[PDB]
């Protein structure tokens, strides 16, 4: 678990990233893309993005990207009270995409790394163990839901 101080860090920080949902959610997604694009695969939509301005352009990838940032957002306001809100995406994930739990470390890093570009100045290193934690949280409990679905 994580401390009531560890999630006040988690969640200053997530104020910011609300103000601009789709430029954060764009960058997120570019990283991933770009630094395992093994991952692209899972997307046919997106399979066809050749560059960063291609994928800079396309109105598809950044609603994907609000998409992914609101269920994100929604899930760590419940300060691990989160079954509810987890459930159907380990459903989903052990189910129809078969994301593996890989997949979501790899996201986990794009996340954290985009924080750190763009906010500097209020991801210091306790924010940062503290966002580490909290997405290490929502991987777990993903990988066990998984597993009770028999995938994982
Ligand atoms: C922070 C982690 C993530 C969150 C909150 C998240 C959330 C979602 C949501 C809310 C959807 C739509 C409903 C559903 O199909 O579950 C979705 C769909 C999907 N997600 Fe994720 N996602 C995350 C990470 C990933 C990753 C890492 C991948 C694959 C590498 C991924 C692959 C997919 C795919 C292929 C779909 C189907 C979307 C479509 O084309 O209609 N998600 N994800």
Known sequence: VLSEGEWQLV???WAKV???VAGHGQDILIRLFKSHPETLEKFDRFKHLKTEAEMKASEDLKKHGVTVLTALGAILKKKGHHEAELKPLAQSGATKHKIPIKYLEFISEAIIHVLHSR??????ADAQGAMNKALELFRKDIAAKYKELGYQ
């Open 11 to 13: 969640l200053h920080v």
């Open 18 to 20: 609300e103000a601009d």
């Open 119 to 124: 906010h500097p100045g209020d991801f210091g």
